[PDB]
Ligand binder design. Structure first.
Ligand code: E16
Lengths: 116, 116
Protein backbone atom coordinates (compact mmCIF):
# COMPACT_ATOMS: atom_id res chain seq x y z
CA UNK A 1 0.00 0.00 0.00
CA UNK A 2 0.77 3.73 -0.03
CA UNK A 3 1.96 4.90 3.43
CA UNK A 4 1.46 8.62 4.08
CA UNK A 5 4.10 10.46 6.13
CA UNK A 6 3.19 12.43 9.23
CA UNK A 7 5.62 13.71 11.90
CA UNK A 8 3.05 13.04 14.65
CA UNK A 9 2.63 9.39 13.58
CA UNK A 10 5.51 6.84 13.18
CA UNK A 11 4.96 4.85 9.94
CA UNK A 12 4.56 1.31 11.33
CA UNK A 13 3.85 -2.15 9.96
CA UNK A 14 2.88 -5.60 11.35
CA UNK A 15 5.75 -7.86 10.40
CA UNK A 16 6.10 -11.50 11.28
CA UNK A 17 9.72 -12.31 12.06
CA UNK A 18 11.33 -15.73 11.97
CA UNK A 19 14.77 -15.64 13.62
CA UNK A 20 15.07 -19.42 13.02
CA UNK A 21 15.86 -19.93 16.76
CA UNK A 22 12.26 -20.12 18.06
CA UNK A 23 8.80 -19.80 16.52
CA UNK A 24 7.92 -16.77 14.27
CA UNK A 25 6.35 -13.80 16.05
CA UNK A 26 4.44 -10.64 14.99
CA UNK A 27 5.94 -7.28 15.81
CA UNK A 28 5.11 -3.70 14.95
CA UNK A 29 8.08 -2.31 13.06
CA UNK A 30 9.08 1.26 12.13
CA UNK A 31 9.41 1.76 8.36
CA UNK A 32 12.75 3.56 8.24
CA UNK A 33 14.48 4.76 5.05
CA UNK A 34 17.39 6.20 7.07
CA UNK A 35 18.27 2.74 8.49
CA UNK A 36 20.96 0.80 6.55
CA UNK A 37 20.05 -2.41 8.25
CA UNK A 38 16.93 -3.79 9.86
CA UNK A 39 16.79 -3.94 13.69
CA UNK A 40 14.81 -6.51 15.64
CA UNK A 41 14.29 -6.96 19.42
CA UNK A 42 16.28 -9.50 21.49
CA UNK A 43 12.87 -10.63 22.88
CA UNK A 44 12.39 -12.65 19.67
CA UNK A 45 15.50 -14.78 20.31
CA UNK A 46 16.25 -17.51 22.81
CA UNK A 47 18.54 -17.07 25.90
CA UNK A 48 20.91 -19.49 24.15
CA UNK A 49 21.69 -18.23 20.63
CA UNK A 50 25.18 -17.06 19.63
CA UNK A 51 25.13 -13.39 18.59
CA UNK A 52 28.16 -11.35 17.41
CA UNK A 53 29.25 -8.00 18.87
CA UNK A 54 29.04 -5.01 16.50
CA UNK A 55 29.61 -1.22 16.55
CA UNK A 56 26.56 0.86 15.49
CA UNK A 57 26.29 4.61 14.79
CA UNK A 58 23.00 6.43 15.49
CA UNK A 59 21.79 9.89 16.42
CA UNK A 60 22.33 8.91 20.07
CA UNK A 61 26.10 8.52 19.45
CA UNK A 62 28.21 5.39 18.80
CA UNK A 63 27.47 2.07 20.57
CA UNK A 64 29.53 -1.14 21.10
CA UNK A 65 27.01 -3.19 23.03
CA UNK A 66 23.39 -2.06 22.55
CA UNK A 67 23.16 -3.88 19.18
CA UNK A 68 24.33 -7.32 18.20
CA UNK A 69 24.45 -9.07 14.80
CA UNK A 70 22.49 -12.24 13.87
CA UNK A 71 24.30 -15.54 13.28
CA UNK A 72 21.61 -16.86 10.88
CA UNK A 73 19.37 -15.13 8.29
CA UNK A 74 16.09 -13.68 9.52
CA UNK A 75 12.90 -14.25 7.51
CA UNK A 76 10.29 -11.46 7.51
CA UNK A 77 6.72 -11.76 6.28
CA UNK A 78 4.73 -8.62 5.50
CA UNK A 79 0.88 -8.80 5.52
CA UNK A 80 0.47 -8.25 1.75
CA UNK A 81 3.29 -10.09 -0.13
CA UNK A 82 3.12 -13.91 0.19
CA UNK A 83 6.83 -14.12 -0.38
CA UNK A 84 9.31 -13.54 2.55
CA UNK A 85 12.13 -11.08 2.86
CA UNK A 86 15.27 -13.03 3.85
CA UNK A 87 17.93 -10.83 5.36
CA UNK A 88 21.32 -12.52 5.42
CA UNK A 89 22.19 -10.71 8.61
CA UNK A 90 20.59 -7.95 10.63
CA UNK A 91 20.83 -6.07 13.90
CA UNK A 92 19.57 -7.11 17.29
CA UNK A 93 18.62 -4.51 19.82
CA UNK A 94 19.52 -5.69 23.31
CA UNK A 95 18.75 -2.39 25.19
CA UNK A 96 15.26 -1.32 24.15
CA UNK A 97 13.29 -3.63 22.03
CA UNK A 98 13.03 -1.65 18.86
CA UNK A 99 11.77 -3.02 15.59
CA UNK A 100 12.88 -1.10 12.50
CA UNK A 101 12.42 -2.21 8.87
CA UNK A 102 15.43 -0.73 7.04
CA UNK A 103 16.43 -0.43 3.43
CA UNK A 104 17.83 -4.01 3.34
CA UNK A 105 14.26 -5.25 3.80
CA UNK A 106 12.59 -2.45 1.84
CA UNK A 107 14.79 -3.14 -1.23
CA UNK A 108 13.72 -6.81 -1.20
CA UNK A 109 10.02 -5.87 -1.40
CA UNK A 110 10.77 -3.08 -3.88
CA UNK A 111 9.79 -0.22 -1.61
CA UNK A 112 10.25 3.30 -2.90
CA UNK A 113 10.09 6.80 -1.52
CA UNK A 114 7.88 8.86 -3.81
CA UNK A 115 8.10 12.67 -3.68
CA UNK A 116 5.48 14.23 -6.02
CA UNK B 1 10.46 11.56 -8.14
CA UNK B 2 10.60 7.82 -7.46
CA UNK B 3 13.55 7.13 -5.11
CA UNK B 4 14.52 3.41 -5.03
CA UNK B 5 15.61 1.96 -1.71
CA UNK B 6 18.93 0.16 -1.41
CA UNK B 7 20.90 -0.55 1.76
CA UNK B 8 24.26 0.45 0.14
CA UNK B 9 23.11 3.89 -1.19
CA UNK B 10 21.70 6.27 1.40
CA UNK B 11 18.69 8.08 -0.10
CA UNK B 12 19.73 11.71 -0.50
CA UNK B 13 18.49 14.97 -1.97
CA UNK B 14 20.04 18.41 -2.42
CA UNK B 15 18.11 20.84 -0.35
CA UNK B 16 18.42 24.63 -0.02
CA UNK B 17 18.10 25.46 3.69
CA UNK B 18 17.22 28.97 4.95
CA UNK B 19 17.82 29.19 8.75
CA UNK B 20 16.85 32.91 8.62
CA UNK B 21 20.08 33.55 10.52
CA UNK B 22 22.42 33.83 7.45
CA UNK B 23 22.54 33.30 3.64
CA UNK B 24 20.56 30.19 2.52
CA UNK B 25 22.75 27.24 1.50
CA UNK B 26 22.28 24.10 -0.60
CA UNK B 27 23.28 20.93 1.26
CA UNK B 28 23.01 17.19 0.71
CA UNK B 29 20.41 15.66 3.04
CA UNK B 30 19.25 12.12 3.93
CA UNK B 31 15.60 11.26 3.31
CA UNK B 32 14.44 9.67 6.51
CA UNK B 33 11.00 8.20 7.21
CA UNK B 34 12.29 7.21 10.69
CA UNK B 35 13.00 10.79 11.69
CA UNK B 36 10.19 12.72 13.45
CA UNK B 37 11.93 16.00 12.88
CA UNK B 38 14.38 17.43 10.38
CA UNK B 39 18.05 17.84 11.43
CA UNK B 40 20.15 20.79 10.10
CA UNK B 41 23.94 21.18 10.80
CA UNK B 42 24.93 24.04 13.10
CA UNK B 43 27.26 25.39 10.31
CA UNK B 44 24.16 26.89 8.57
CA UNK B 45 23.49 29.27 11.50
CA UNK B 46 25.25 32.44 12.70
CA UNK B 47 27.39 32.06 15.84
CA UNK B 48 25.09 34.75 17.33
CA UNK B 49 21.77 32.84 17.35
CA UNK B 50 19.75 31.57 20.33
CA UNK B 51 19.13 27.81 20.22
CA UNK B 52 17.17 25.77 22.78
CA UNK B 53 18.59 22.76 24.70
CA UNK B 54 16.90 19.44 23.85
CA UNK B 55 17.24 15.76 24.70
CA UNK B 56 17.24 13.27 21.81
CA UNK B 57 16.81 9.46 21.84
CA UNK B 58 18.31 7.64 18.83
CA UNK B 59 19.99 4.32 18.00
CA UNK B 60 23.10 5.34 19.95
CA UNK B 61 21.21 6.09 23.22
CA UNK B 62 20.19 9.37 24.90
CA UNK B 63 21.91 12.73 24.32
CA UNK B 64 21.39 16.01 26.25
CA UNK B 65 23.99 18.11 24.46
CA UNK B 66 24.42 16.88 20.91
CA UNK B 67 21.26 18.42 19.41
CA UNK B 68 19.64 21.87 19.88
CA UNK B 69 16.14 23.08 18.97
CA UNK B 70 15.88 26.19 16.66
CA UNK B 71 14.38 29.55 17.62
CA UNK B 72 13.21 30.73 14.16
CA UNK B 73 11.36 28.69 11.52
CA UNK B 74 13.56 27.13 8.85
CA UNK B 75 12.67 27.37 5.14
CA UNK B 76 13.64 24.45 2.85
CA UNK B 77 13.45 24.40 -0.96
CA UNK B 78 13.66 21.13 -2.81
CA UNK B 79 15.05 21.09 -6.41
CA UNK B 80 11.64 20.34 -8.03
CA UNK B 81 8.92 22.15 -6.02
CA UNK B 82 8.65 25.94 -6.21
CA UNK B 83 7.03 26.45 -2.77
CA UNK B 84 9.27 26.26 0.36
CA UNK B 85 8.70 23.78 3.17
CA UNK B 86 8.39 25.85 6.34
CA UNK B 87 9.29 24.18 9.63
CA UNK B 88 8.25 25.98 12.81
CA UNK B 89 11.16 24.37 14.64
CA UNK B 90 13.62 21.66 13.84
CA UNK B 91 16.73 20.03 15.32
CA UNK B 92 20.27 21.32 15.01
CA UNK B 93 23.35 19.11 14.94
CA UNK B 94 25.91 20.92 17.10
CA UNK B 95 28.61 18.41 16.14
CA UNK B 96 29.31 15.90 13.34
CA UNK B 97 27.20 17.55 10.67
CA UNK B 98 24.09 15.54 9.83
CA UNK B 99 21.43 16.78 7.40
CA UNK B 100 18.32 14.70 7.69
CA UNK B 101 15.02 15.50 6.11
CA UNK B 102 12.36 13.93 8.37
CA UNK B 103 8.60 13.51 8.34
CA UNK B 104 7.86 17.11 9.28
CA UNK B 105 9.39 18.10 5.92
CA UNK B 106 8.21 15.02 4.02
CA UNK B 107 4.58 15.60 5.02
CA UNK B 108 4.70 19.08 3.40
CA UNK B 109 5.99 17.59 0.06
CA UNK B 110 3.14 15.10 0.04
CA UNK B 111 5.91 12.51 0.53
CA UNK B 112 4.85 8.85 0.69
CA UNK B 113 6.39 5.35 0.98
CA UNK B 114 5.16 2.86 -1.60
CA UNK B 115 5.32 -0.88 -0.92
CA UNK B 116 3.82 -2.77 -3.90
C1 E16 C 1 15.09 11.60 17.27
C2 E16 C 1 16.02 10.99 16.19
N1 E16 C 1 15.26 9.85 15.70
C3 E16 C 1 15.94 8.72 15.10
O1 E16 C 1 17.12 8.74 14.99
C4 E16 C 1 15.11 7.50 14.64
N2 E16 C 1 16.03 6.67 13.67
C5 E16 C 1 16.38 7.20 12.39
O2 E16 C 1 15.94 8.24 12.09
C6 E16 C 1 17.27 6.39 11.46
O3 E16 C 1 16.92 6.59 10.13
C7 E16 C 1 18.72 6.77 11.75
C8 E16 C 1 19.13 8.03 10.98
C9 E16 C 1 20.52 8.37 11.46
C10 E16 C 1 21.72 7.60 10.92
C11 E16 C 1 23.12 7.94 11.41
C12 E16 C 1 23.32 9.07 12.44
C13 E16 C 1 22.10 9.84 12.97
C14 E16 C 1 20.69 9.49 12.48
N3 E16 C 1 19.39 5.58 11.26
C15 E16 C 1 20.17 4.79 12.20
O4 E16 C 1 20.30 5.13 13.34
C16 E16 C 1 20.79 3.50 11.60
N4 E16 C 1 22.23 3.64 11.65
C17 E16 C 1 22.96 3.46 10.39
O5 E16 C 1 22.36 3.19 9.39
C18 E16 C 1 24.49 3.67 10.38
N5 E16 C 1 25.17 2.64 9.57
C19 E16 C 1 24.81 5.06 9.75
C20 E16 C 1 26.13 5.80 10.11
C21 E16 C 1 26.44 7.19 9.50
C22 E16 C 1 25.45 7.87 8.52
C23 E16 C 1 24.14 7.13 8.15
C24 E16 C 1 23.82 5.74 8.76
C25 E16 C 1 20.36 2.22 12.38
C26 E16 C 1 21.22 2.02 13.64
C27 E16 C 1 18.86 2.35 12.76
C28 E16 C 1 20.52 0.98 11.47
C29 E16 C 1 16.47 5.32 14.30
S1 E16 C 1 16.08 5.39 15.93
C30 E16 C 1 14.69 6.49 15.78
C31 E16 C 1 14.30 7.12 17.14
C32 E16 C 1 13.46 5.76 15.24
C33 E16 C 1 16.48 12.00 15.09
C34 E16 C 1 17.66 12.82 15.65
C35 E16 C 1 17.08 11.33 13.83
C36 E16 C 1 15.26 12.91 14.73
Amino acid sequence: PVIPLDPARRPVIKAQVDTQTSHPKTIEALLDTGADMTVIPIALFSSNTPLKNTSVLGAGGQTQDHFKLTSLPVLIRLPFRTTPIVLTSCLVDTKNNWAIIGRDALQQCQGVLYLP
